[PDB]
Design a protein around this nucleic acid. Structure first.
Length: 97
DNA sequence: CCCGCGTTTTAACCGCCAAGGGGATTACTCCCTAGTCTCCTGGCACGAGACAGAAAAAAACAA
């Protein structure tokens, strides 16, 4: 049959909140880090541990930001997060101007 | 707008194979060092110095 929209989303929320493994596949993230670093200094080498630490910090920060975004969206009587939500959360945080 | 399902490809992995490059050993080559071989014109005349030196053992013959 068909699951009504919004139920499988709750199932994934339950699934991913019980687990800790990283949600971004490694190699694209590593290539993105390498590209970003290249603009600061050339012919650079990275320890896999450094790259893993970068991924852990980035994913945790993104999860916290998504939590704040969901809270902001709920405050607007809304269920869907939209860019203004991220913007407001970042603004109140003080990272974005 | 966004969710849930149907279809495609490669990208992430592994295994084996084949181009292309790096290190220890090997092919030469160049320079240096080390060690030899041979020669120093055609000759001619005359002279003078080297006639080995010690020591052990068997035999002849005087006594």
């Amino acid at each position: 049959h068909r699951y009504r929209p919004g139920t499988v989303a709750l199932r994934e929320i339950r699934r991913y909140q019980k687990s800790t493994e990283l949600l971004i596949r490694k190699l694209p993230f590593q290539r993105l880090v390498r590209e970003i670093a290249q603009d600061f200094k050339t012919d650079l080498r990275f320890q896999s541990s450094a790259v893993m630490a970068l991924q852990e910090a980035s994913e945790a920060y993104l999860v916290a930001l998504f939590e704040d975004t969901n809270l902001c969206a709920i405050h607007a009587k809304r269920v869907t997060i939209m860019p203004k939500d991220i913007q407001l959360a970042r603004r109140i945080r003080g990272e974005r101007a």
